[PDB]
Amino acid sequence: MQAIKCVVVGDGAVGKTCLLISYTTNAFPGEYIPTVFDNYSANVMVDGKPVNLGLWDTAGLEDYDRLRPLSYPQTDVFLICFSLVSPASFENVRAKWYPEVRHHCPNTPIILVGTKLDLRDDKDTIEKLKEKKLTPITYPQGLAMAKEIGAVKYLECSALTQRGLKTVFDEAIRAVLC
Amino acid sequence: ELPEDNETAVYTLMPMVMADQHRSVSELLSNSKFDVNYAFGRVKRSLLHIAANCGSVECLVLLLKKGANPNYQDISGCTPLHLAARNGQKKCMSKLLEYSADVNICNNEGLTAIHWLAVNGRTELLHDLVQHVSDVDVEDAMGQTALHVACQNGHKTTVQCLLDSGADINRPNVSGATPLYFACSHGQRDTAQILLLRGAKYLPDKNGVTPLDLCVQGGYGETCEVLIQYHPRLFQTIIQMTQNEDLRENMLRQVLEHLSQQSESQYLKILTSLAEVATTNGHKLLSLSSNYDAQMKSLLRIVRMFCHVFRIGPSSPNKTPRSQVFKPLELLWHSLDEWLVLIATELMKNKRDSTEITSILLKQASADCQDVISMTANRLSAVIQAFYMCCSCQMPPGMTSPRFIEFVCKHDEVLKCFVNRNPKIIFDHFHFLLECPELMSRFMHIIKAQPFKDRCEWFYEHLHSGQPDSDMVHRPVNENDILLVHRDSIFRSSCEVVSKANCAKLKQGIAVRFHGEEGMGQGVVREWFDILSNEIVNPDYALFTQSADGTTFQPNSNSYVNPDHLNYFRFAGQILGLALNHRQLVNIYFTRSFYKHILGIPVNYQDVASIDPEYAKNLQWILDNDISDLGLELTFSVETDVFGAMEEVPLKPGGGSILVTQNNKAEYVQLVTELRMTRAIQPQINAFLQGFHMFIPPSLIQLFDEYELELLLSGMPEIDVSDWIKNTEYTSGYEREDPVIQWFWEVVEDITQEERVLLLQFVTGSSRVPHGGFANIMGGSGLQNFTIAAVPYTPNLLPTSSTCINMLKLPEYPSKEILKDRLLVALHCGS
Ligand SMILES: Nc1nc2c(ncn2[C@@H]2O[C@H](COP(=O)(O)OP(=O)(O)OP(=O)(O)O)[C@@H](O)[C@H]2O)c(=O)[nH]1
Structure with a gap:
């Protein structure tokens, strides 16, 4: 039996908590609660021998900006995450996350994932964004961002309606294995 | 010490609790009046929640002894039990229970300690917890029990403990979900196999979605074989699901592949079932009343799996039974032959009708009926397309079945009649002409008569099928396959690696990376073509010579100086054809003569002017006037360059003794053409064609003329924003x-x-x-x-x-x- 460590990193209010609770329990929280620490698990198969998947999550506060590095050691995969409806978080990837993750762990593969796809599909969301004179983030340049930050792959997923959720972890496990 | 203000107090306490300074907090807790139960922030999470979440066991006991309530729930409804349960801190659990912490409390959505514990699958904690938990089958808001999520995440040991505790095995969800149903949703093997041993029941959801509906959609072959082991009846249901259009074709291939390698017996079963259902669909397809789009799509859908699965050979862990499954298909082929005879009789009716039409012409309701036959022809075009694919896989690639060739020619009029009635048929179903050159000749003239636009896209879909595409995948190619050369001496560097490196590896990749650099970009690689292309036409290399017009390039007559020009010209052909394969543009403007050589079309008199306009004017004048009475005294012999030496050589064996006159002047000019532009640089062309056709088959490119090839190969000359x-x-x-x-x-x-x-x-x-x-x-x-x-x-x-x-x-x-x-x-x- 073999085990791997996977970590989720991204700005607060992005949907990291929703991604792992929805995947593991199909349940979507109704309220708005930041976190300080979380953990999950799953299973996969390799050559007839089970392989365990370990998933860690981290917060965004300044105090946890230093503890989050402390959770990186012996990490085998990273999942940098950003909010598809919040351009500021996407811009923060270049400013904060891409330098930060590479500074602590540059060797391991990096995967870019976009959440809040449900708000991205909602028509009312673009209406309020339009009044605010804002436009949602798009796919083709997001892949360019993945190249710029050296991320192996770029994916888009939902947590409420689960559109494309399952592919996120399949590419992650596929990417790390090969 | 902590300030009297609670907000500052918690901000001070919050950092130490992680550090777990057991002594330090003690004095602050004892000598301060702050309330531990106080909720801070919008989330209104108590300090106990933060302490419980982390592993600082010491702070828990101090906080609890100060009056902290372990049963307190925040706005989300999660209590200290939940946060500690997720992290599986056994010390926290023991101390929480010691001081009156109850485990039966639930959050807003109904999630309890058992649910979080089940998700993480900490069976050791489950052993003690269940003894304290009042009920193990507590349902959430959506009516899902603990076993539902535990099986979904594939925790083999978690399910074993729960079943030993009497957990329900057939609890239906609000929609009617079964713990097997959720296990198959995420494609779990061990949990599904365990459930079958205990005797899990198979029932569909209230919504009407059977468990196998997701299994086929998920394409998890591992779960299928265990399910089919105990329920062989459902094996047929997989074949039936093929008819539905809501299921993706790609998934069904992989699942059917996995079942195939198991044993030859199931391999035969898959083939026989596909042929049987295909036979039923074919007869339904022929019927006029049946839906036309749905039936042909279903038949083509099923045939594609049969063709692919047939090509996948078995493994030890090639005889008649591969041909026996064609016997159900020969029934389909027999009907196709009979229909091809029936349409042949229809041609007699059409020919008999033609007698009435021709008789009126000589002396000078049916439209709807013809349309139905044309619609029937469209449906007939689908089945014949399926027959071609079955024949194609009947033996190794690159060969057409002799049985296929004999009858298709036997019904040549039928095919040529249909295309005239419906020119779109080639662009809808009748696509396989591009494989057989012999069949191409019969329809090439017909196809070329059709609009160029309809020819362009049909070319694209066929060629792009064989691409080594990686764009959307954007997975870097193996470094061993990616070339790594320095840009300096682009012409020399690029060729050296291509010839020296293994041919197979090069043809399997697309990346172009420079040695010592990580640069990788379509624009940069597109620029690489520009620099490489210019060097090819650079007069310094002498490979190509500027045309008289000054806007086009063709190979130089002096290019033979370079000893390895054959090899380098061959390399150039590969590069240029590579651009066409992926459709990037090459800035070079080749001459009209050169493009014809790519297609193999012989040059004509006008091409002579490309080198000597004055001589061409003589060749056009001689044709335009009779020379029998002009006394030119010119035979089939003209001076030509022979290895750099000007010598008189006959154009054909014994041509010097054959006088050129009106009867034989037409070919005389024709022979002179290849004498000048083709033979002179024939060795160069031979190498170039060899490289070009490696990636662009002659038959596929022959479909387009010289003008169309340049537009595709070089691009649009006129632009406007x-x-x-x-x-x-x-x-x-x-x-x-x-x-x-x-x-x-x-x-x-x-x-x-x-x-x-x-x-x-x-x-x-x-x-x-x-x-x-x-x-x-x-x-x-x-x-x-x-x-x-x-x-x-x-x-x-x-x-x-x-x-x-x-x-x-x-x-x-x-x-x-x-x-x-x-x-x-x-x-x-x-x-
Ligand atoms: N409808 C919808 N809402 C989402 C989605 N992703 C995130 N949200 C909302 O965004 C809020 C903030 O995300 P959280 O659940 O707190 O996860 P997080 O942003 O990573 O917060 P931390 O884990 O503490 O860093 C959630 O409460 C959700 O309501 C989504 O994909 N669809």
Whole structure:
């Protein structure tokens, strides 16, 4: 039996908590609660021998900006995450996350994932964004961002309606294995 | 010490609790009046929640002894039990229970300690917890029990403990879900197998979705074999599901593959079932009343799996039974033959009807009936297409079944009649002509008569099928396959690796990376073609000579000096054909003669002027006038270059003794053509054609003439920005810096056409422009519409663009004068 460590990193209010609770329990929280620490698990198969998947999550506060590095050691995969409806978080990837993750762990593969796809599909969301004179983030340049930050792959997923959720972890496990 | 204010107190306490200073907190807790139960922040989470979440066991006991309530729930309804349960801190659990912490409390959604514990699968904690938990089958808001999620995450040990505790095995959800149903949803093997041993029941959901509906959709072959082990009846249901159009074809292939390698018996079963259902669909397809789109799609859908699965051989862990399954198909083929006879009788009816039409012509309701037959022909075109695919897989590739060739020719009139009635049939179903050159000749003239547009896309879909595509995958190729050479001496460096490196490895990759650099970009690679292309036509190499018109290039007659010109010309053919394979443009303008050589079309008299216009004028004049009475005294012998020596050589064996006259002047000019432009550089052409056809088969490219090939190979010669914007004169554009856009429109028209191309060259990387205008711009990810991104303006700022993505970073210039000056400066530096 073999085990791997996977970590989720991204700005607060992005949907990291929703991604792992929805995947593991199909349940979507109704309220708005930041976190300080979380953990999950799953299973996969390799050559007839089970392989365990370990998933860690981290917060965004300044105090946890230093503890989050402390959770990186012996990490085998990273999942940098950003909010598809919040351009500021996407811009923060270049400013904060891409330098930060590479500074602590540059060797391991990096995967870019976009959440809040449900708000991205909602028509009312673009209406309020339009009044605010804002436009949602798009796919083709997001892949360019993945190249710029050296991320192996770029994916888009939902947590409420689960559109494309399952592919996120399949590419992650596929990417790390090969 | 902590301040009297609680907000400052918790902000001070919050950092230490992680550090777990057991002594330090003690004095602060004892000598301060702050309330531990106080909720802080919008979330209103108590300090106990933070302590419980982390592993600082000491702070828990101090907080609890101070009156902290372990049963307290925040707005989310999660108590200290939940946060500690997720992290599986056994010390926290023991101390929580010691001081009156109850485990039966639930959150807003009904999730309890068992659910979080089940998700993480900490069986050791489950052993003790269940003894305390009142009920183990507590349902959530959606009516899902603990076992539902535990099985979904595939925790083999978790389910074993729960079943030993009496957990329900057949609890239906609100929708009717079964713990097997959720296990198959995420494709778990061990949990599904365990459930079958205990005797899990198979029932469908209240919504009507059977468990196998997701299993086939998920394409988890591992779960299928265990399910079919105990329920062989459901094996047929998989075949039935093929009819439904809501299921993706790709998934069904992989699942059927996995079952195939198991044993030859199931391999035969899959083939037989596919043939049987295919036979039923075929008869339904022929019926006029049946839906036409659905039936042909279903039949083609099923046939594709049968063709692919047939080609997948078995493994030890090739005889008759592969042909026996064709016996159910020969029933389908027999009906097809009979229908091909029946339509042949229809031709007699049409021919008999033609007698009435021709008789009226000589002496000089049916439309609807013909349409139905044409619609029937369209449906008949689908089945024959399936028959071709079955024949194609009947033996190794590259060969057409002799049985296929004999009857298709036997019904040549039927096919040629249908195409005339419905020219779209070639572009809808009758596609397989491109494989057999012999069948191509019969329909090539018919196909060429059709509009070029319909020919273009049909070419694209076939060629792109065999591409080693990686664009959307964007997975880097193996470094062993990616070339790594220095850009200096591009012509020499590129060829050296190609010839030295293994041929198989090179043809399996697309990446072009320079040695010692990580640079990788479509625009950069597109620029690599430009530099490489220019060197090919560079007079220094002497490989190609400038044409008389000065706008086209063809191989130089003196190129033979280089000893390895055969090899290098062969390499050049590979590079040029590689661009056509992926559809990138090459800036070189080849001569009319050269493009004909690519297609193999013989040159004519006009091509003579490419080298000697004066001599061509003599060849056109001789044809235009009778020479029998003019006494030219010219035989089939003309001076020609022979290994750099001017000598008199007959054009054909014994031609010197054959006088040229009116009867034989037509060929005399024709023979002279290859004498000058083809034989002279025939060795060079032979090598070039060898390289070019490696990636572009002659039959596929033969479909297009010289003019069409250049447009595809080199691109559109005439361009205009109005195509991008699809307008001529608006007061505003995209409502983005419109006054700047107007100036941007004013500058582009003022600047000459040639320098506007250079602007596109910088962003795109190729001097030429793709066919179809701006509607078919290829960027980093293929089709990508050109766009411009606004940037804040700074003094002496020039526009910039990431060449991989065909997009421009245009600063918000406040005046037109600055706008035009800055781009002009960029042109100077960007050259
Ligand atoms: N409808 C919808 N809402 C989402 C989605 N992703 C995130 N949200 C909302 O965004 C809020 C903030 O995300 P959280 O659940 O707190 O996860 P997080 O942003 O990573 O917060 P931390 O894990 O503490 O860093 C959630 O409460 C959700 O309501 C989504 O994909 N669809």
